[PDB]
Write a protein that binds this DNA or RNA. Structure first.
Lengths: 62, 63, 140, 63, 63, 67, 61, 61, 57
RNA sequence: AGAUAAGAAUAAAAUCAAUUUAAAAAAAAAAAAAAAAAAAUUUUUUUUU
């Protein structure tokens, strides 16, 4: 399920490539997670909405 | 023609009509008769966008 | 002369214009009287041959001649961030905002601001509404 | 919900599928984890995909 | 819930429908199963057309 | 919504716009909290999550009450 | 936010509405709900809030 | 997570607001709610949290 | 008329103010505004708009 | 008069005129409710179907 998978990524502190519904790509590292929001410690802290995300992939196997 | 028809009540000049107001939306087809040269009489309905012309199938001054 | 062309009915509203402004402009710029039948063909009431030819050139430049297809070399004309008004023909400004001009790496419009500069341009927006819009090949 | 069993049937047969995202993108992989809000892929690239962003699916073979 | 019975009626009649997605893409085929968030529709094989991704539906015949 | 029911009662021709900007001309015939059916030329269903804005061609009678 | 919207409706303030697309609309609030706006324009108009990106008033409420 | 918006409001941080359409806005929170954010920069405006894709600040908080 | 009043501020023509403006309250009847010639406050206060008046009692 | 049957993915860059069309042109307040719904404190609610 998504919530435990997100916790496992956070636990393993895995760098991910995040994709947005607009066709946006980004790369970052997890700061924290929420039922509606994803927070990243890569560069400046980013609050990314779950309704805005299309896809998530890890750089290294979770 | 399927996408609107030219219908003359009288004279050589042919006035326009369209799929809805030909027959007050009784059908989805442009003409209930659906036949060229068919005898059903025609007269104007009031509605007139400046870029549109209306000549509905209407007999006997139905208005 | 009373010269005539059996030109395409559909362009009628664009040869008259809202308020008859473009027909008034055409008649005054050609110094020649014009009829363009709403259903029928154009007539040109002219004093002499060169003035009739001038009227033909101007109405031909706004009849048919659809700008849909391959790249054309349009004259930039007005240039601003909110748009270059790049015209391939008369009365047809291809209003091309920086968003049309550019994606990813982007720059201040001074990098390519000029008037009358011929530049490569093709269609990016189309409609029946006459809000059809072209764009600089940098849009690729 | 019959959608979860359809996805489970694809997972059971381990069928490679083409998933189409609403943005107009094909992605390719094998159906793996499945939640009411998200779908994972068991393909070499382990994708996690939001179902709100999924438009349509076609398989390599009928399920 | 107007949509669910309409979709069931299409599934019952297996009438060819044109579905449009939010991105403006057309698909064509016959509904033969649905659920509250998804439609299974055949053109090559019965497959997922997600209702949240649908903009419009229009059938070939009245149902 | 009562506004959409009032439009359905008065059977007013409306212009509906989609989120992608596509413009649909038709008269709304049925509505649920997910969808509208409009039967302009052929029966069609439009999802409300895909609609951006709706405007009537004719005037629409005020609800004549507190909102 | 609820009182701010009521104040805009009370004061009949001209507002600029922007959808997800690059459209700009001018109107005033006629009625408002957590799912919809009814907007004064050339005619009374319905806007679904899921289509709106931002609203900015011409005068502060 | 929840007070992140309050922390930005407390530090009055100019924050880049990104809408799904890919547009970037700039400004600080005036107030925030589960469904909507009201912005302090220039004229006060309401941006639907539903329409917001991401927020990233000028400084970390 | 019952439905509203035509109200003159100048020489250039001014259309009907609707009774729903003229009267704040539910009733909306001609008895509230039957007196001809009366001098009254009148501000259109409207841009990007067609001709209307926000007179209100 | 129809909208690409989906560009493996826009580190992120508001498009002109939304009532139309030919000389305009036709012109139109009744409004707080503070969340909609269900369990009976919660949840869904256009912040992941």
């Amino acid at each position: 399920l998504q919530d435990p998978f997100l916790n496992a990524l956070r636990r393993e502190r895995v760098p991910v490539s995040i994709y947005l519904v607009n066709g946006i790509k980004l790369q970052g590292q997890i700061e924290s997670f929420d039922q509606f929001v994803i927070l990243l410690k890569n560069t400046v802290s980013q609050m990314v909405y779950k309704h805005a995300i299309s896809t998530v992939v890890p750089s290294r196997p979770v | 023609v399927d996408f609107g028809a030219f219908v003359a009540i009288g004279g050589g000049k042919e006035g326009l009509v369209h799929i809805s107001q030909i027959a007050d939306k009784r059908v989805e087809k442009v003409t209930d008769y659906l036949q060229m040269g068919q005898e059903v009489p025609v007269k104007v309905l009031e509605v007139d966008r400046q870029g549109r012309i209306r000549l509905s199938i209407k007999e006997a001054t139905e208005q | 002369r009373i010269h005539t062309i059996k030109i395409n009915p559909d362009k009628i509203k664009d040869v008259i214009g809202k308020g008859g402004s473009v027909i008034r402009a055409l008649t005054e710029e050609t110094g020649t009287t014009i009829e363009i039948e709403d259903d029928g063909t154009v007539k040109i009431a002219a004093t002499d041959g060169e003035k009739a030819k001038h009227a033909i050139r101007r109405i031909e430049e706004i009849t048919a001649e659809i700008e849909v297809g391959r790249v054309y070399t349009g004259k930039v004309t007005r240039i601003v961030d909110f748009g270059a008004f790049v015209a391939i023909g008369g009365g047809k400004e291809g209003l091309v905002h920086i968003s049309q001009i550019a994606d990813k790496r982007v720059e201040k419009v001074t990098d390519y601001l000029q008037m009358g500069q011929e530049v490569p341009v093709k269609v990016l927006e189309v409609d029946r509404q006459g809000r059809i819009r072209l764009s600089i090949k940098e849009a690729t």
